[PDB]
Amino acid sequence: TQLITVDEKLDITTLTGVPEEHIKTRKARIFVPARNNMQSGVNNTKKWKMEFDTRERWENPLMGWASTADPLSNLVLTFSTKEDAIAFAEKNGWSYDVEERKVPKPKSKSYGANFSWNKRTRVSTK
Amino acid sequence: GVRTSPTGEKVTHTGQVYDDEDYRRVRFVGRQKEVNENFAIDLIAEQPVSQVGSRVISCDGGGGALGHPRVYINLDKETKTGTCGYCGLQFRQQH
């Protein structure tokens, strides 16, 4: 009730219990996931996924499976703004690589321009 | 119709048989590598190539709601039989 409050940083990584091997060695990456190019629809955009980089996946020598010694291998954290992403990553301690968002560039096309006269943009097929 | 590779044992209908330098052959010691010896590709020659008088014909699979779904295949390839991707059995055209 109107207590101590001091304007500083945060150090939660000494509390969330994941060991320090995984703290300092593993590396995070924040990116908007690209449109999977075969479909053309960008509802899969608008989010900022935090992922971890991949590591070794050998052969399971009895069945032909891919085991791993990576508990963090299948994290994903879908966010809504780059600021809160970076704030969370620095709040929880490990390092992070920021790739920036890329919209499709707006264009200038028209069907009448596909029916040109002395301009070379000509439909040529139909 | 199995092969005996120079490792010395049965092979399957997938190209997966071993090398001599393997420990997995010796973990097969005492218990037999069971495998279906009624292979797959040899049950294509047993099926006759039917000859239908039509042109754009049907394949169902021997049973209404028992098998693979309907697919209509064409016979335009004059020397090549139509092949259902599901069935595996062939068709021809008779003018």
Binding site: - | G64, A65, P69, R70
Partner: protein
């Protein structure tokens, strides 16, 4: 399986710490990493003695979020199997209470009758116990022709057998001596400790989720829930047996009031179609394919619902992203709520009475983990 660290003044008590969490399995986390239709059986098996009301509550959670009502034959068949499940959980809770209190034989009598009931599940779906069988969107793959007459047979013979159970026990002198004085519950306790169902029936207040908020066609059968008066464990025992006999009533009226509509919804974008249209469509094939790959998308928002498990308030709380994965499921468990007040239920007794207390609130310990 529990851990009980009790602290007792001699052949009496003072306190008891129920160390529970032996049976934690991480169910909510695993559902947070799966889809709806895939992760239904976790809801089937967190509780396990009651086994189709769990299905029923999850299916009603999804159908209530998705604003889709099942066809009426689905509702009545779901009511029938809710009554079978109610009958089954109360008969096993009575018999495991009897077996742990002593009393070797009625356990085996009622388990032969339950063996008929597992034959009925087998004929319905095929599984012994954990039949999934209740999809969201109504029941899947309806009953084979020749089951309702078997249920009619079971109703007759089982009325006879449960009257023979009350022939054996209930005016048993020393079983009454064994459990009358123990397990008192104040109405203020029954509110503040968050009790659910049979404890509320037993101690005072007339209360039923089924009756007050009829979440299905329960509103259109004549039945009457038994209430307790003294708020007591023998009285609670009689309450359970008469809820079984009321379930006999509900099965009889359900068989006489059956509409022959259809199994699933015809909104094929939620329930998958059947084989004939599947093997020759195009839209039904696509719906089959993507409906089993992705899972249908579920509009965002957080819902809660609760039905009357034979324990009590089986509550379930979904939080959905616009997604086919639920963002957060969570389950209100009557086992957890009933284990919650154990000190204030057992301050003034001794240890065999404590084992009777663990009996008289029906436990599975699967569901107490959530």
């Amino acid at each position: 399986v529990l851990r009980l660290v009790m602290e007792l003044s001699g052949e009496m008590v003072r306190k008891c710490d129920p160390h529970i969490g032996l049976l934690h399995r991480g169910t909510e986390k695993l559902i947070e990493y799966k889809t709806y239709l895939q992760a239904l059986p976790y809801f089937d098996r967190l509780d396990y003695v009651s086994m189709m009301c769990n299905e029923q509550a999850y299916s009603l959670a999804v159908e209530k979020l998705l604003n889709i009502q099942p066809p009426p034959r689905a509702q009545w068949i779901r009511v029938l199997f809710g009554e079978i499940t109610r009958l089954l959980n109360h008969i096993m809770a009575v018999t495991t209470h009897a077996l742990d209190i002593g009393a070797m034989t009625p356990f085996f009598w009622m388990f032969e009758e339950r063996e008929k009931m597992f034959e009925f599940y087998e004929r319905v779906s095929g599984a012994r116990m954990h039949a999934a069988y209740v999809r969201p969107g109504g029941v899947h793959q309806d009953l084979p022709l020749g089951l309702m007459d078997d249920i009619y047979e079971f109703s007759k013979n089982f009325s006879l057998r449960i009257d023979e159970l009350e022939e054996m026990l209930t005016n048993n002198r020393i079983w009454r001596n064994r459990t009358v004085d123990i397990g008192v519950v104040t109405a203020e306790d029954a509110l503040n400790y968050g009790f659910s169902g049979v404890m509320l029936r037993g101690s005072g207040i007339q209360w039923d989720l089924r009756k007050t908020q009829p979440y299905d066609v329960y509103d259109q059968v004549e039945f009457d829930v038994p209430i307790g008066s003294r708020g007591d464990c023998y009285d609670r025992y009689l309450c359970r047996v008469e809820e079984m006999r009321q379930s006999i009533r509900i099965i009889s009226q359900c068989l006489n009031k059956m509409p022959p509509g259809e199994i699933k919804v015809d909104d094929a974008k939620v329930s998958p179609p059947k084989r004939a249209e599947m093997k020759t469509s195009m839209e039904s094939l696509i719906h089959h394919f993507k409906l089993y790959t992705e899972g249908y998308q579920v509009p965002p928002g957080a819902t809660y619902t609760a039905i009357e498990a034979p324990k009590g308030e089986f509550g379930v709380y979904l939080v959905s992203d616009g997604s086919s994965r639920p963002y957060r499921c969570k389950i209100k468990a009557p086992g957890f709520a009933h284990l919650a007040g154990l000190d204030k239920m057992s301050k003034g007794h001794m240890l065999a009475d404590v084992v009777a207390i663990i009996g008289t609130q029906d436990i599975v310990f699967g569901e107490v983990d959530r």
